[PDB]
Amino acid sequence: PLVFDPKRAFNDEIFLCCSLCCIIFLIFLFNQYEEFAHELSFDIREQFG
C-alpha cells in the first residue's frame, strides 16, 4: 500500500525549503499588490507610469 507519511514528509529537507519559499513568494506578491493599489498616485496611463 501507498500511504502518505506526514512524519517522513516533515523530516525531509526539500519539502520544508520549498514550502518556506512558496510562503515568502506569496508574502511578496501580497505586499507588491498592496503598493500598486493604495500607495502610488500615477497609473498605467502616463509616461513613466
Binding site: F36, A37, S41, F42, I44, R45
Partner: protein, 111 residues
C-alpha cells in the same frame, strides 16, 4: 547482478557526527553559502527595522510629484475608453464605484 539490489537494500554508513547535517557543514562551499545568508540576515535586515524604530514617530516630508496641471484636465481631448467599458484605471477601486463598471456582467458560460 542488477544494481537494483542496492536500490532495494542500500548499505548503511557510519558517521562520527551526531547527524549528517553537522557532517555536511564541514564543506567550505556550504559554509560560504551560510555566511552569505548570515550577512544578509545580520546587516540589512536588523538595520532596516532599526531605522523603522529610529524614525517611528516622524513624518515623511518628501514633496509630492506633479502629474497633470489644471489646464490639461482634458488630456488634449484624448479617448479614454478602457477595455472594461468605463473610464477608470484598473486598480482605482473607489473611482469604479462611482461608475459602477461591474453592472455589465456576462454569463457564466456561452449562454
Amino acid at each position: 547482478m542488477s544494481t537494483n539490489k542496492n536500490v532495494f537494500f542500500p548499505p548503511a554508513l557510519h558517521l562520527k557526527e551526531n547527524s549528517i547535517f553537522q557532517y555536511k557543514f564541514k564543506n567550505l562551499a556550504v559554509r560560504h553559502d551560510a555566511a552569505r545568508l548570515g550577512i544578509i540576515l545580520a546587516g540589512p535586515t536588523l538595520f532596516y527595522w532599526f531605522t523603522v524604530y529610529y524614525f517611528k514617530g516622524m513624518p515623511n516630508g518628501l514633496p509630492p510629484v506633479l502629474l497633470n496641471p489644471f489646464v490639461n484636465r482634458n488630456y488634449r481631448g484624448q479617448k479614454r475608453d478602457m477595455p472594461w467599458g468605463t473610464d477608470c484605471a484598473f486598480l482605482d477601486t473607489k473611482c469604479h464605484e462611482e461608475k459602477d463598471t461591474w453592472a455589465k456582467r456576462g454569463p457564466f458560460f456561452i449562454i
